[PDB]
Every structure is written in C-alpha cells, then in structure tokens.
C-alpha cells in the first residue's frame, strides 16, 4: 500500500534530468521514435501549413531508473511525470506556426528494466510545399522532420520504430486520403556544427485529395 511511493522516492532521490541516461558518457542514447498519426486535422494550401494530431511515442532505456520487482512486491511498471526525467529534445524542424518541441508533458510509463515509454500528444503545424499544378486532383507529399535539436548523432541516436508511421488509430479524414506513408532516418551536417552530423527522422505522407466537393462546387 506504500511500496510505489517508496520506489518513486528511491528512484529520484539524487536523479539528474540534465545528464544523459547512460552508464558511460561515451555511450550513445538509443531512442526509438514512432509517430502515430491520429487525425489529419487540416491542410491549409494558401498558408502551406499541415496541421496534424499525433502521438509521438519515444522509447528508451534509462540506466538509472532500474529496480528489482521483488523489492517492491512485484511492481513491474509505474507512471511518473515526464518533467522529472531526462527526455530527448525532439524538435519538428519544419514547424510553421506551432511549437517546436512537445508541450503536453503527460506521464511516462517506466518499467523495472528501465525502459521508458512516452506517448505525448501534439498538434504539429508543419510546413509543406503545396503543389498547385494538378489541383484539385493533386497528390501532396507532406513531411515531418523530427530530430534531437542539441544532441548530435554521436551522442543520442534516434531510430524509427517501424519503416512506416503507425496509422492504426488514424481517424479517416473527409478531404484527404493517405495513399502512402514512410519514415526515413537521415544524418546531415549543418554549417553551425561542422564536426558533428545530426540525426533526424523524416516521416512523409503521400496524401491524395478527394476532388468530389471541388468538382461539384467549382469545376
């Protein structure tokens, strides 16, 4: 009736959310990143902004957040606020008018093995180059470049959870149909930081417009 409180107290007595959660500083933090697209909220062509409801699942092993279940009556998982732990600073590079990083700090699920799963919701208003040529029968290829802003590839490595975005919970939109989706990991060198390439995961979605409304009302 009090073992979970004891566990939470023991874990965070001298925990530091600033340092990376690795045993040795020369190690690389392996983060698994899975974008779950819940709803394609809007595709504003005139502003070239795509607004999407997402859950940004991030999974990583925190070396210092292990515990032995037998010490706590078999507790194998706990829920803790994300503000207390170290987190990857995933930033949407192509943000248009939203937030760059996650602002809804939901609770993370911590397991006895140290595995943390964090599934924060976000409303990404990303930039997308709207091709107007074949409008209103156009196919748009809109992308989300997500990556650790300050940690470079030799320090924190992000890997995609699967080759494709998670569309299992995707609410079907009435104007655009996701014909294709795919995620590619890239390493690129910026002029700020010539000695350290930075990793990113570019999710992309080939969405086809449903032209019936525009056929009736315009064509």
């Amino acid at each position, epitope marked *: 009736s*009090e*073992h979970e409180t*004891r*566990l939470v*107290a*023991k*874990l965070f*007595k*001298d*925990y530091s959310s600033v340092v990376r959660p690795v045993e040795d500083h020369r190690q690389v933090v392996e983060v698994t990143v899975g974008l779950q697209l819940i709803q394609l909220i809007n595709v504003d062509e005139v502003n070239q902004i795509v607004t999407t409801n997402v859950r940004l699942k991030q999974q990583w092993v925190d070396y*210092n*957040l*292990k*515990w*032995n*279940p*037998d*010490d*706590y*009556g*078999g507790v194998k998982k706990i829920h803790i606020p994300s503000e207390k732990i170290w987190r990857p600073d995933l930033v949407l590079y192509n943000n248009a008018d939203g937030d760059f990083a996650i602002v809804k700090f939901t609770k993370v699920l911590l397991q*006895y093995t140290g595995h943390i799963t964090w599934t924060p919701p976000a409303i990404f208003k990303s930039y997308c180059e709207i091709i107007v040529t074949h409008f209103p029968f156009d196919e748009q290829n809109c992308s989300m470049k997500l990556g650790t802003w300050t940690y470079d590839g030799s320090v924190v490595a992000i890997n995609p959870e699967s080759d494709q975005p998670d569309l299992s919970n995707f609410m079907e939109s009435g104007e655009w149909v996701i014909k294709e989706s795919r995620g590619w990991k890239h390493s690129v060198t910026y002029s700020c930081c010539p000695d350290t390439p930075y990793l990113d995961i570019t999710y992309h979605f080939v969405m086809q417009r449903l032209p019936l409304y525009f056929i009736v009302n315009v064509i």
Partner: antibody
Amino acid sequence: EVQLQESGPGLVQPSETLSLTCTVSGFSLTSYSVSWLRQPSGKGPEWMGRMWDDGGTVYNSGLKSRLSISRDTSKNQVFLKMNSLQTDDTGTYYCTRDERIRAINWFAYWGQGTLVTVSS
Amino acid sequence: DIVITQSPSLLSASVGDRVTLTCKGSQNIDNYLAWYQQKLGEAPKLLIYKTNSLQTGIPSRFSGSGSGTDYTLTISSLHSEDLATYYCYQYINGYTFGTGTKLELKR
C-alpha cells in the same frame, strides 16, 4: 566497524513461531536497509525479506503470509517472526546490511548467521 | 527469476595458481552480478559487485569479468587465506544464488 549479530533459539518445535533478533552496530537503521536471508540445509541461500531504512517492510512472495519483520531504532534491533514452521525451514539465517545505487539494492554486509532446526 | 549455475562445483588448485570460477545465468544478468566469499563458521564477505567493482578492503588479487549471461571471478594468485566457498548472486530480477564453488588446495 559495521557489524550485525543474529540471535535466537537453536531448536524450535514444529508449528511454533521462530523469532530472530539482528542486533546492529556501526550504522543507524534509519539510513541502511536490513534484509533477512536463509540458507536451507543442502540448498543455496534465498532471500526472505527486507526492513527498509524508512521503516517499511517487504517480503518474499512465497513467505509473505508466514513472515513479519519489525525494527527498534532506539535499540538498533531488527526482529523476524515466522509462524507455521515446518521441517523444511531448517537452515542458517543471516541478516544483511544492504547497499544501494538509486533503486537497486544488493547485500553488502552479512551477519554470522544462526542455525535454526525445526524438529519435534 | 534468473536461474544461476556455477562451475566447477568443486575445484582443486595449489597456492599461487590463477583460478577462474564461472557463473552462468538463464537470462541476461546485465552485469548485476556479485561475488561473495563464505567460510565455514564465518560471516559471508562480499568480494565484488556490478561484476567488476572491488569491495573496499578486498585484496587486489580478486578481479571480476563477464557480460550477458556468463561471468567469471579470477584470483591471480591463490593464497592460503582464499580457500573457501564462492557464491555468485544476481540482484537485477529477484535474488538468486548459485550452488556455490568449493575451492580446496591441491594434494
């Protein structure tokens, strides 16, 4: 410096209750956890339970119903009480001071151990 | 929980010899293995924790190594004080102890 001393009856009747007292010296129970282990005759040691520094307790799932652990921080004593004793409880009982790194615990110091034999 | 086995069950070696006791688990122990020395009638003494961290006051001749599911305890030069039983145990998932390796001087 750090020392732990188990004491208790050398022979206990079956179905009676065993009581063991681990006296502590060299450290304060308010800052170090004290675990109880037992080594059955002809078997490897097994973990029985822990009295936490914060005064809480935790027990082995197989022995949770049969075990109680308490402490007296004024006397620096840890008490183990076990009921429904059986022949299989015959073995050497140790109390250990536990070290910690964050939430992970391991047995850092052992007591000398008390032999308990359960026979009618 | 992670079952642990030790080898050899009984080992004979002469004074000064290097000895390497082996401890193998049924699952990845993730270096959360400790070694302690128990003598007949004496309180067990911890030798090594986290597979290589030497306990304060332990002679430097004791060293630990291992990874995954296989670990070893090495005595570079066996002294007469070191004839005892050595137990490996694991504290990452429950608490499990090896059967123990009894070390005797060769005759």
